[PDB]
Design an enzyme around this catalytic site. Structure first.
Site, PDB file in Angstrom:
ATOM      1  CG  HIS A 210      37.039  40.709 103.143  1.00 47.47           C
ATOM      2  ND1 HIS A 210      37.532  40.002 104.216  1.00 47.47           N
ATOM      3  CD2 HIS A 210      36.471  39.799 102.320  1.00 47.47           C
ATOM      4  CE1 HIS A 210      37.272  38.720 104.050  1.00 47.47           C
ATOM      5  NE2 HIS A 210      36.632  38.570 102.907  1.00 47.47           N
TER       6      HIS A 210
ATOM      7  CD  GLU B 232      32.905  35.854 102.506  1.00 44.12           C
ATOM      8  OE1 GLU B 232      34.051  36.118 102.145  1.00 44.12           O
ATOM      9  OE2 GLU B 232      31.983  35.626 101.713  1.00 44.12           O
TER      10      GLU B 232
ATOM     11  CE  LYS C 156      41.090  33.661 102.023  1.00 51.54           C
ATOM     12  NZ  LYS C 156      39.668  34.063 101.871  1.00 51.54           N
TER      13      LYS C 156
END
Lengths: 368, 381
Positions: B178, B254, B50
């Site tokens: 996250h 990530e 993204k």
């Protein structure tokens, strides 16, 4: 005048055969809005601010009805040209014009161009020699009335035709008295220019008109007062208006489904398959607010709606009174015609929600 | 050091290509990836595409052996087109859509994340036997435990979820978390890693053996004011922690911003000037509706370079919409610029073009590969 709204049964049947999210535009409603302005404000030709909605069927409808177009870029005038729209029915009304756009404008033979700054003259004279220019007037952006005539003479001097003037009256400050005072200032400047050697022939009034009839003023009576003021002050001059939000805003709806539910807190959360990177980008960029209709019956509580992406900010509504919703339930968002899907993106790899034409569906015939 | 175009280079690129355009250095994306393999070895890479989906970048990464963190059907489809197998993907959107899950099913993507029970039966029905990791809320890099957010189950309900998913036929593979964007410190990880040890240790005794741990992203990129983290030092403190706590499990990260952020530059032209205000006003041909959209969506300030000397006055820059919102910088010290002059924005790699639009019918600024331009050859010389 009603705003375009879809009934609960229409939302269910449409969603059966179009995958959500999708937009639904009513060509009938756009026409109604075009014919309204024409009826009550007959002396203004219509420059459609296609930035607001650039959908091809709406655009074709409008060329069918006689509308001219207000182009902001090369890509705008490219879309129009493939629909058979000539550059003589285009005005290039971006104040600061791209090189790529001025080139396009020469190729397509765009007639009218607008400007507020003398740095802009230097480059239009090279790019489109002898083009018809109007000055934007502030009565930020716009040019001081007292510099308006010097600006046209500088333009005329560099080999451009001083054709006239535009103002924009803001919707917030919209009033009949306001348009009347701008027309008086415009009239003075015309007369003054003439004695200055320039025959101004065109006057562009702007948009800044609102709506549907469930809103503040009597607009029919307001346009008639402005129209009567044009006829007494400008009986020989070409008058124009450039509606954008007015043409489209209440002529489109979004249909979108709940794809997840979060039930952890005091507040239920509902994830929809459209968000702030798609059609609700209006929230960030237009600072606008869309009426949301959930369709369950039952008791309501404060509830958050979120969009479909991995970002924290993809939140559309909070503390919104809504009933209990399941996954696959459909919600409906009115006022989705202007400045929404223009700002949409493929962020997160997501598709742009298509716009479906209401009049090409059984449900429209079914209204009888 | 960060990929930054010379002035000499902006000028010749602008001769051959119309502004605005972006310029990606594939060398720099490779340094960045390699740097992360060198200093955070224990952490396998799921590139968060993204941030930047550019097809040449993606193919570079596939070739270096990276996996991909995939967020939608469209992001999978692009990867499939470049020959990337579904085993290389994790569908790491906690709330998935019907088109996404069919794409995931078609392309045999192995891994999925979730943070809620309403997700489970949607996944069981659409890919049975899939490896799932439960996404979990933790203290963010800001030191908040925010449970009212869009993503993350509480630690308290993490294992039941995972069991609930095993009860629906899904393989309970692990845990992801996250900590958020722009981590300037290593505290959030070390702390979160230890919380994660506990759920595995507690899961061992329930009789679920967890095999995978995804530690998310948040690795920094320099902004308008620079960056003062020692990334190597930061990365080794995290690595060090993964070796004491998780010797025997597969650990993944990530990154998104980190991977491409410092590899991309925007070349844009000053196209108009306003001189009526007290501050000079420069209009560029990229705006808030284009790559500067990250001002709006990412709350981010990009580093701007004007070229010239002998002046500096506080000056304003705006976008080509010519709109109230289309303002990029105010009070920016800049020399006297003229229409036609080129400016540079650096560290434009991430969460930039992805949010760009065709509002006003403008084009999406294209993304030029620097290694294919004649300016690169000059560099090797």
């Amino acid at each position: 005048m009603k705003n375009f709204r879809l009934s609960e049964k229409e939302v269910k049947t449409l969603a059966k055969r179009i995958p959500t999210p999708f937009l639904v535009a009513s060509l009938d409603k756009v026409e109604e809005n075009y014919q309204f302005m024409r009826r009550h404000l007959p002396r203004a030709g219509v420059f459609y601010a296609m930035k607001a909605n650039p959908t091809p069927e709406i655009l074709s409808l409008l060329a069918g009805l006689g509308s001219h177009f207000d182009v902001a870029s090369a890509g705008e005038m490219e879309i129009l040209h493939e629909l058979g729209v000539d550059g003589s029915q285009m005005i290039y009304a971006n104040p600061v014009k791209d090189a790529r756009g001025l080139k396009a404008a020469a190729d397509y033979n765009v007639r009218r161009f607008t400007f507020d700054d003398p740095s802009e003259i230097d480059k239009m004279a090279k790019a489109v020699p002898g083009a018809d220019v109007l000055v934007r007037i502030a009565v930020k952006f716009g040019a001081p009335v007292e510099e308006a005539l010097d600006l046209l003479k500088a333009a005329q001097d560099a080999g451009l035709h001083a054709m006239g003037i535009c103002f924009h009256v803001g919707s917030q400050s919209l009033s009949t008295a306001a348009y009347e005072e701008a027309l008086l200032v415009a009239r003075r400047l015309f007369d003054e220019a003439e004695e200055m050697g320039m025959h101004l022939t065109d006057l562009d009034i702007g948009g800044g008109f609102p709506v549907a009839k469930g809103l503040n003023v009597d607009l029919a009576a307001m346009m008639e007062a402005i129209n009567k003021q044009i006829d007494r002050l400008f009986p020989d001059t070409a008058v124009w208006t450039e509606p954008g939000r007015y043409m489209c805003g209440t002529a489109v709806n979004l249909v979108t489904s709940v794809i997840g539910t979060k039930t952890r807190g005091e507040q239920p959360w509902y994830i929809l398959d459209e968000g702030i990177y798609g059609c609700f980008s209006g929230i960030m960029y237009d600072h606008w607010t869309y009426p949301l209709h959930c369709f369950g019956k039952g008791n309501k509580k404060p509830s958050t709606f979120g969009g479909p992406s991995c970002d924290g900010i993809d939140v559309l509504y909070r503390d919104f009174m809504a009933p209990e919703l399941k996954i696959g339930d459909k919600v409906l968002v009115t006022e989705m015609g202007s400045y929404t899907s223009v700002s949409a993106t493929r962020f997160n790899g997501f598709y742009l929600a298509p716009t479906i034409i209401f009049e090409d569906q059984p449900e429209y015939a079914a209204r009888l």
